[PDB]
Design an enzyme around this catalytic site. Structure first.
Site, mmCIF file in Angstrom:
data_model
loop_
_atom_site.group_PDB
_atom_site.id
_atom_site.type_symbol
_atom_site.label_atom_id
_atom_site.label_comp_id
_atom_site.label_asym_id
_atom_site.label_seq_id
_atom_site.Cartn_x
_atom_site.Cartn_y
_atom_site.Cartn_z
ATOM 1 N N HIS A 72 0.843 -1.186 0.000
ATOM 2 C CA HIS A 72 0.000 0.000 0.000
ATOM 3 C C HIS A 72 0.889 1.250 0.000
ATOM 4 C CE1 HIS A 72 -4.016 -1.879 1.038
ATOM 5 N NE2 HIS A 72 -3.155 -2.797 0.737
ATOM 6 N N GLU B 12 0.921 3.822 1.817
ATOM 7 C CA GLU B 12 1.265 4.180 3.179
ATOM 8 C C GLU B 12 2.386 3.297 3.701
ATOM 9 O OE1 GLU B 12 -1.783 3.701 1.802
ATOM 10 O OE2 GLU B 12 -3.283 4.911 2.719
ATOM 11 N N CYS C 290 -6.762 2.428 4.505
ATOM 12 C CA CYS C 290 -7.544 1.250 4.763
ATOM 13 C C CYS C 290 -7.209 0.783 6.173
ATOM 14 C CB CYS C 290 -7.190 0.189 3.703
ATOM 15 S SG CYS C 290 -5.669 -0.717 4.043
ATOM 16 N N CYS D 148 -3.650 -0.479 6.760
ATOM 17 C CA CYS D 148 -2.646 0.579 6.930
ATOM 18 C C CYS D 148 -2.733 1.237 8.287
ATOM 19 C CB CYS D 148 -2.813 1.628 5.863
ATOM 20 S SG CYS D 148 -2.350 0.877 4.270
HETATM 21 ZN ZN LIG Z 1 -3.966 0.574 2.929
#
Ligand SMILES: [Zn+2]
Ligand SMILES: O=c1ccn([C@@H]2O[C@H](COP(=O)(O)O)[C@@H](O)[C@H]2O)c(=O)[nH]1
Ligand SMILES: O=c1ccn([C@@H]2O[C@H](COP(=O)(O)O)[C@@H](O)[C@H]2O)c(=O)[nH]1
Ligand SMILES: [Zn+2]
Lengths: 294, 294
Positions: free
Chosen positions: B102, B104, B129, B132
């Site tokens: 991801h 992040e 999400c 994360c």
């Molecule tokens: Zn995420």
């Protein structure tokens, strides 16, 4: 009573022990309670649904397979049918951290694979991690699902996941536990047919890669797992984990697996084969075959 | 300018384009900005740090590798040093959904692997999400880390993850980005030594399984990735992903990898070997070796 339940049961309230002792008699108690069984349990104790669910969480946590953490988590998913499904976390020595199953994913997968069409609530004995809140937001219950935790007041998922990412962000309208059938013809023997049937129920709107795993036990039992994608990608439940969730909740253990089959498309963007074989070999199974959909 | 930045740059405000054009001149612009560069950018535009970070998110998202979703996410992690690190999401055709990176995680890993000791804030162009939010709660910044999203007001992580699960629940006191050195002797050639050095910086308090991957490029560049566990287990960043985060942010592409080495203990509870080789073969690299720590 399967040995796992023995300490948990001993610590239950007397009238609960009495009402449960018939149900838990069978070693292969399916870690699930029908609406009728829940009604009887309520009559025998006076507990309402939420308090009953909390009282029962020691038995759900008793199914946890935690060789790394020794941190047992139990979850009870309550189906719209009235059936309650247990779930517990699982860790696999010799595999990776990405193969771990959380109690919440176990309970939801138990319900979905058993054919439950929607969940009303989920009760857990520890607060859900962000990975699980994200998993739960894939469901057709969306942000309204209610979580019940010991000592807290109930809350919908939207309270545990503010400003949520989910399928709507990727313009997906098919949600997990919605009716899905991908129409692949079932060919081969019993085990491959079970794997293809599982692949037919796949929730895979993001990669369009259907897959299913079926495991055959020493006594001939077949446990199947369908693939469930997630909008945030990583919380995806791989096919093998579904089958292992079922095998474990139903009272079996990894040395009972004899054969395993994975069904998936040949030209698929994502491939489950390597992680399926590697985790199964780690668990001891070495008879793994792959049938491929077209 | 590396071709990826070309459309994003063209859409930037004129005074920003002017201030950036020197920095982005080099094809191997390191997708990072020092405190000094941030100061100059602020003088040239009048933007404050948060608004500058938002203005720059198109360039971070321009580094995304998204063959499945075509959903590019950019993140900018702001180090306590004053250095800003870009990050973008990555998807790998031929692997699984569990191998996805991801934006992040990319930005945080960029900062940690670059030697950043703590983060002050993270700016993302889309809400994070749950996976994360859980990843971020592993950091030594805990729940205080501030997230900045377009159109929202800033919030600490505790607002995005109420009643959070994290290392404290498993009685872990060593947090990610805290100073860690596991003391394994560096042996072998340059690439294996780089892999072992990466394993020495592992955040692995839950399984105690150290690992690191180092990738050697055609031109001799080595990119290394340390293993970072998570309390919720699944959001763990595997070693290979760290190296691929670096390779991609720094302007290289998968066909530039020549060799790769994975270092890990032989008797370790969790084993990275299978997922490392399988994802690398999917990306085209086939020269993968494993050196093992003792
Ligand atoms: Zn995420
Ligand atoms: O949301 C959560 C948080 C933790 N655990 C689990 O507890 C253990 C430690 O984390 C692992 O087995 C992991 O699956 C859960 O089941 N659910
Ligand atoms: O928190 C989030 C949510 C989504 N995406 C990513 O966007 C894509 C679709 O989800 C994937 O690449 C996934 O890594 C992120 O980077 N961060
Ligand atoms: Zn969880």
């Amino acid at each position: 009573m399967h040995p796992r339940f023995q300490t948990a049961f001993a610590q239950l309230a007397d009238n609960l022990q009495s009402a449960l002792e018939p149900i838990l008699a069978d070693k292969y108690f399916p870690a699930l309670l029908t609406g009728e069984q829940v009604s009887s349990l309520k009559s025998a104790t006076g507990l309402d649904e939420d308090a009953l669910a909390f009282a029962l969480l020691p038995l759900a946590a008793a199914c946890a397979r935690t060789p790394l953490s020794n941190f047992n988590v139990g979850a009870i998913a309550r189906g719209v049918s009235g059936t309650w499904y247990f779930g517990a976390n699982m860790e696999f020595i010799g595999a990776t951290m990405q193969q771990t199953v959380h109690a919440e994913q176990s309970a939801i997968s138990h319900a979905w694979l058993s054919g439950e069409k929607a969940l009303a609530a989920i009760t857990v004995n520890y607060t859900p991690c962000g990975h699980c809140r994200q998993f739960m937001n894939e469901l057709n219950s969306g942000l309204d699902l209610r979580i019940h935790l010991p000592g807290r007041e109930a809350h919908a998922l939207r309270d545990y996941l503010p400003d949520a990412f989910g399928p709507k962000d990727l313009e997906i309208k098919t949600l997990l536990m919605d009716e899905q059938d991908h129409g692949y013809a079932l060919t081969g023997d019993a085990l491959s047919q079970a794997a293809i049937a599982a692949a037919n129920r796949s929730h895979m709107p993001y990669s369009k890669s259907p897959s299913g795993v079926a495991l055959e036990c020493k006594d001939g039992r077949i446990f199947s797992g369908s693939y469930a994608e997630n909008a945030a990608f990583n919380p995806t439940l791989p096919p093998l984990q579904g089958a292992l969730i079922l095998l474990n909740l139903k009272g079996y253990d990894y040395p009972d697996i004899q054969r395993a089959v994975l069904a998936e498309k040949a030209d698929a963007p994502l491939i489950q084969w390597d992680a399926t074989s590697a985790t199964l070999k780690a668990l001891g199974c070495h008879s793994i075959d792959r049938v491929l959909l077209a």
